């Protein structure tokens, strides 16, 4: 832990805090209600979810190291250049500083020639260049390893599924809103954005051509084909085929939701029955993911709970109240779709679904943030698939 | 070096940087030229000089520790709770954050009931309370030791002059502008500040009653009586009486400058000869301080220079270019009064002297910042007065 690393963590976090405060006041007074900020909020939602994911990943690394979860061995990392929690904090703070600066430029641009729609383009271009620049520049080993995983994950059936690919595909399943916002940005730039004044002022926000449904299922599709690939590599259907069923429930939920969204303008009487199908399949998917979590993912609700009631018999975390709060919050957050459909169906507030998605996306990232702790703890305690050698 | 200490250093410095940037832009556009900002700049000049002194003191501690200057033994400190450079950085960053917040409130106040003239009052009241609050609160040992020294220094003839009192009195001699601004704040509040709207909009800026001359000489008076006290304790006139002469040159310079400032309105023909006396005594004082610095204070220009030309024979700092640049910059900064009188006499710009003092006060703090390095290095190498036991 070099002194300048912690200094950069604190420096970036302090600049981040002051910039978030400045953003809040700028939105309160400086921002004008005439321009619609929904495309802006979606693009910067993708960015902010990435930054929040990096912060929570640093917290996860901190918890794993101070609890005993040997995530270095689980992730198959070299124990020489493994990224510490502080380094993830610098990455998150750096990208958050550029996020805040780009958003502030979108609020007020202190340049007369440079337009506003380039600031997000420049921001995400800097993210991509930071990820893929060939030179041995900032954190070269980390992003090279991440780029290798990003290549292996998106071409899943042709590579043997190790733990790193699984884990990253699950994080992508949590961060599907980032892919959603990337697709929305591309569609908005190519079709709706008038390259004249700004990005303020929609044929890309809905499922008109069904492309967004494909983007929704892309993480689910990768996980599904990884389960099938693991079936081919090891003929054992009990974990893998049921997990693939768990992801195909997501497939069915997404396609029925898209079908209802398309049919709401068609006027077909089958719209109501498609809504029924979407609701029941959302129930099935929510219970399927929740049960899989608490049983096979976290390993809780074991038959050998003992003193640790409603839990397993080895516990590495200090307080069990963490476990019970995690179980509960998992129940609501997996079933948060019930809350969202209730508020979007019992109210007539304009652009309700956009607000609901905007607030519940960080809650989904937080849900996977909590999921990481107990999934990796379960893996550290007893092997689940991707070890095949020892318990550790 | 705890991790959270460096984290607080970085956090405070980052907030400081963003707040200084916000202050710059606020002064560029938000600030209104109708209100005179000179009293504001003087009060916050005292504050900023204190913060800059703390930053440079942290830099000095860093240099002393990584060079070998045993300032812990020289200052007579317990080697258990001695303040590290990082802790001084937290103190400086904390006070700088409150300084920036108070100045920003003076620019725009986000409160309708609270007036503007309390923000500096609240800021310096917080400084005093942080210094003198009896509880074992933030950095209790440090400010207790500092308060003991602040008591011993201001009552000098009745206490035996150790190194700590000398050193702190010299820093007060450098930071005489802080006492100047404190006196100006008290006089402005008591006489000129209308407690109706704000501090914007002078019988306290000049030497009308000669009080400011006393405030100027107060650090010089303390050093003079410390030299006399050291003469009484040790009958040896060679260091102490000549040093007291060095400070009485400051006395003569200050009283002649005040006499000229008073006589400029009298119209007496003796005004010109008083200006001559002030100029020649400023020359004498500048050469007296500069020669004392490079000869007895820093120990340079020794007769045993050897390879280290124009220096001494033991050097602890890596590069000699530091020494030569220090010598030079000492020549200009001690003689910076020549630059200031030249620009204030050959130009007719309004409020020139205020600008000159505002810019050259941090240069005086920087001059003592450089003075600390070589004075403490000379003391570490060979004893100068306040050791009497060993060379170290
Ligand atoms: C509209 C939204 C558009 C969004 C824009 C597109 C997204 C931009 C993508 C760029 C941002 C990502 C910044 C890169 C941070 C990655 C840091 C990282 O991977 O640290 C990890 C830390 O190691 C760990 O496994 C512990 C924590 C788990 C790390 C999980 C990987 C991080 C995933 C975050 C990026 C996901 C991609 C998101 C795309 C939407 C790699 O470690 P290492 O390489 O340094 O050491 C391994 C030893 N070697 C190297 C020798 C093999
Ligand atoms: C208009 C302007 C008005 C200005 C307002 C008035 C000024 C406000 C005054 C409050 C600000 C000062 C904040 C206090 C910081 C002091 C920190 C400090 O003294 O650290 C020092 C660090 O120790 C050292 O000696 C090394 C560096 C030299 C320290 C020099 C003292 C600092 C002087 C700064 C304040 C000067 C006062 C300025 C008044 C104008 C004390 O160490 P310690 O107490 O922690 O350890 C010693 C062991 N014990 C304690 C057991 C004996």
DSSP string, B1-30: --HHHHHHHHHHHHHHHHHHHHHHHIIIII
- Give CA separation, A80 vs A77, A338, B254, in Å: 8, 45, 64
Q: How far is Cα B91 from Cα A381, in angstroms, rounded to an integer?
A: 45
Pick among B3, B5, B13, B14 to test the A interface (most A CBs inside 10 A): B14
Half-sphere exposure of A114 (CA within 13 A, CB side): 13
Task: Tell me if residue B54 falls in helix, strand or coil.
Answer: helix
Of A101, A94, A115, A127, nearest in space to A5 by CA? A94
Tokens in use for B358?
């505002």
Alpha-carbon distance of B263 to B269, in angstroms, equals: 9
Which of A129, A45, A145, A18 minimizes the C-alpha distance to A87?
A145
Rounded to whole angstroms, how far apart are CA atoms A380 and A71? 8
What SS3 class is residue A208? Answer: coil
* Cα B370 to Cα B298: distance, rounded to the nearest angstrom: 10
Interface test with B, best of A1, A5, A7, A20 (most B CBs within 10 A): A7
The radius of gyration of chain A from alpha carbons, rounded to an integer in Å, stands at: 22
Alpha carbons within 13 angstroms on the beta-carbon side of residue B200 total 14
A1 CB neighbours in chain B (<8 A) are 3
How far, rounded to the nearest angstrom, does the alpha carbon of residue B369 sit from its chain's CA centroid? 9
Residue with tokens 């003092």: B357
With an 8 Å Cβ cutoff, is B101 touching chain A? Answer: no
- Which ligand sits nearest to residue A53's alpha carbon? 1
CA distance B361 to B45: 9
Residue A188 is given by DSSP the state: I
B164-172, Cβ contacts within 8 angstroms, sequence gap of 24 or more: B164/B75, B164/B76, B165/B226, B166/B223, B166/B226, B166/B386, B167/B75, B169/B219, B169/B222, B169/B223, B169/B226, B170/B223, B170/B368, B170/B371, B171/B53, B171/B368, B172/B218, B172/B219, B172/B222
| Rounded Cα gap, residues A335 and B207, in angstroms | 76
- The pair of structure tokens assigned to B275 is 């200006």
Evaluate whether A179 touches A220 at the Cβ level (below 8 Å): no
- Assess contact for B116 and B108: CB atoms under 8 A: no
Of all ligands present, the nearest one to the C-alpha of B47 is: 2
Which residues in chain B touch residue A21, judged by CB atoms under 8 angstroms apart? Answer: none
Distances (CA, A) of A128 to A27, A123, A143, A183: 28, 9, 10, 15
Resolution in A: 2.9
Q: What's the CA angle centered on A167, arms A164 and A172, to 5 degrees?
A: 120
Q: Which of B64, B60, B131 is nearest to B95 (CA)?
A: B131
- What token pair was written down for B235? 């009958």
CB atoms within 10 A of CB A172: 19
Cβ–ligand 2 distance for B91 under 6 Å, the answer yes
User: Is residue A10 within 8 Å of residue B14, measured between CB atoms?
Assistant: yes
Do the Cβ atoms of A346 and A155 come closer than 8 Å? no
DSSP secondary structure string for all residues of A261-294: HHHHHH--THHHHHHHHHHHHHHHHHHHHHHHII
CA distance A197 to chain B (A): 24
Chain B residues in contact with A29 by the CB 8 A cut-off are none
Question: Are the beta carbons of A72 and A82 closer than 8 angstroms?
Answer: yes
**Per the annotation, where are the binding residues of B for phosphate?**
170, 173, 246-247, 334, 367-368
Closest C-alpha to A67, from A389, A328, A373, A384: A373
Q: How far apart are CA B186 and CA B154, in angstroms?
A: 19
How many CB atoms sit inside 10 A of residue A52's CB? Answer: 18
In whole angstroms, what is the distance from residue A375 CA to residue B18 CA?
Answer: 40
Containing H/E element for A387?
Answer: none
Chain A residues with CB-CB distance to B94 below 8 A:
none
Residues 6+ apart with CB under 8 A from B42: B181, B184, B185, B354
Could you tell me if the CB of B178 is within 6 A of ligand 2?
yes
The encoded tokens of residue B77 equal 């400190």
Q: Among residues 20-59 of chain B, which lie with CB inside 8 Å of chain A?
A: 22
Q: Which residues of A are annotated as a binding site for phosphate?
A: 170, 173, 246-247, 334, 367-368
Report residue B353 as tokens: 């002297």
CA pair distance B84, A300, nearest whole angstrom: 48
| Chain center to CA of B283 | 21
Give the tokens for residue B373: 């390095």
Q: Please tell me the distance between residue A82's alpha carbon and the centre of ligand 1 in angstroms.
A: 11
Q: Give just the sign of the alpha carbon dihedral A42, A46, A51, A53.
A: positive
Structure letter (DSSP) for residue A295:
I
Pocket probe for ligand 2: among B146, B177, B376, the residue whose CB has the most ligand atoms within 8 Å is B146
Other beta carbons less than 10 A from residue B115's beta carbon: 15
A81 vs A146: CA distance, rounded Å: 13
**Measured in Å, how far apart are chain A's first and last C-alpha atoms?**
26
Which of A299, A285, A175, A152 shows the shortest CA–CA distance to A226?
A: A152
How many of the other CB atoms lie within 10 Å of CB of B345?
A: 10
Orientation of helix B38-67 relative to helix B352-381, angle to 10°: 20
Cβ neighbors of B256 (< 8 A, separation 6 or more) are: B274, B277, B278, B281
SS (H, E, C) B256-314: HHHHHHHHHHHCCCHHHHHHHHHHHHHHHHHHHHHHHHHHHHCCCCCCCCCCCCCCCCC
Helices and strands: H and E segment counts in chain A: 14, 0
Three-class secondary structure of residue A307 per DSSP: coil
CA distance A270 to A291: 31
Closest CA to B371 of B308, B290, B306, B304: B290
CA angle B369, B370, B371 (to 5 degrees): 90
Pick from A257, A252, A260, A230: nearest CA to A243: A230
Residue ID of nearest Cα to ligand 1 atom 5:
A124
Neighbours of A338 (CB within 10 A): 14
Residue by residue, DSSP assigns B335-350 as THHHHHHHHHHS---T
Largest CA distance in chain A: 69
Local structure of A2: helix, strand or coil: coil
**Within its chain, how far is the Cα of A287 from the centroid?**
20
Taken as a whole, chain B contains a residue count of 392
Q: What are phi and psi of A44, to 5 degrees?
A: -75, -15
- The H or E element spanning position A362 is helix A352-381
Q: Is A213 helix (H, G, I), strand (E, B) or coil?
A: helix
**Smallest Cα–Cα separation from A246: which of A311, A175, A170?**
A170
Q: Whose CA is nearest to atom 11 of ligand 2?
A: B127
Cα→Cα distances B100→A354, B5, B95, B103, B161, Å: 38, 21, 9, 5, 37
CB-CB neighbours of A210 under 10 Å: 14
Structure tokens at B12: 């405070």
Structure tokens at B44: 């916050």
Rounded to 10°, the helix B352-381/B336-345 angle is 170
3-state DSSP percent of chain B in helix, strand and coil, to 5: 70, 0, 30
Task: Report how far apart, in Å, the C-alpha atoms of A13 and of each of A67, A83, A92 are.
Answer: 25, 18, 9
B103 with B37: CB under 8 angstroms?
no
Cα angle vertex A257, ends A256, A262, to 5°? 95
Residues of B in contact with A10 (CB under 8 A): 6-14
Inter-chain CB proximity B15 and A13 less than 8 Å = no
């Amino acid at each position: 832990a070099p002194a300048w690393t912690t200094f950069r963590v604190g420096l970036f976090c302090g600049i981040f805090i002051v910039l978030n405060i400045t953003l809040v006041l700028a939105a309160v007074f400086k921002l004008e209600t005439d321009r619609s900020i929904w495309p802006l909020i979606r693009i910067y939602r993708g960015g902010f979810l990435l930054i929040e994911f990096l912060f929570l990943l640093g917290i996860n690394t901190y918890g794993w190291r101070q609890a005993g979860v040997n995530h270095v061995l689980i992730f198959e990392l070299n124990p020489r250049s493994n990224l510490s929690h502080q380094h993830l904090f610098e990455i998150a703070g750096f990208l958050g500083i550029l996020w805040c600066l780009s958003l502030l430029a979108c609020f007020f641009a202190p340049i007369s020639v440079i337009p506003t729609y380039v600031y997000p383009l420049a921001l995400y271009g800097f993210m991509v260049f930071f990820l893929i620049n060939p030179t041995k520049t900032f954190y070269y080993k980390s992003r090279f390893w991440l780029l290798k995983l990003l290549f292996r994950v998106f071409t899943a059936p042709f590579h043997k599924v190790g733990f790193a690919d699984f884990w990253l595909a699950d994080q992508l399943n949590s961060l599907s809103v980032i892919l959603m916002d990337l697709e929305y940005m591309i569609c908005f730039y190519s079709l709706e954005l008038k390259w004249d004044e700004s990005k303020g002022l929609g044929i890309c926000h809905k499922y008109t051509y069904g492309v967004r449904a494909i983007v929704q299922c892309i993480p689910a599709w990768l996980r599904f084909i990884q389960c099938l690939r693991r079936y081919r590599d090891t003929k054992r259907a009990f974990p893998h085929l049921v997990n693939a069923g768990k992801y195909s429930t997501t497939f069915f939920m997404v396609t029925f939701a898209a079908l209802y969204s398309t049919h709401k303008e068609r006027g077909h009487s089958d719209t109501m029955v498609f809504f029924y199908l979407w609701i029941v399949f959302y129930i099935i998917s929510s219970c399927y993911t929740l049960i899989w979590d608490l049983k096979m993912d976290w390993g809780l609700f074991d038959k050998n709970a003992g003193e640790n009631t409603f839990l397993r018999e080895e516990i590495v975390y200090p307080q069990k109240a963490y476990y019970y709060c995690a179980i509960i919050e998992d129940v609501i957050l997996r079933f948060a779709w019930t809350i969202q459909i209730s508020i979007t169906s019992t109210t007539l507030l304009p652009h309700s679904g956009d607000i609901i998605a905007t607030v519940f996306a960080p809650l989904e990232v937080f849900r996977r943030f909590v999921w990481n702790f107990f999934r990796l703890e379960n893996e550290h305690l007893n092997n689940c698939g991707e070890f095949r050698a020892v318990r550790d």
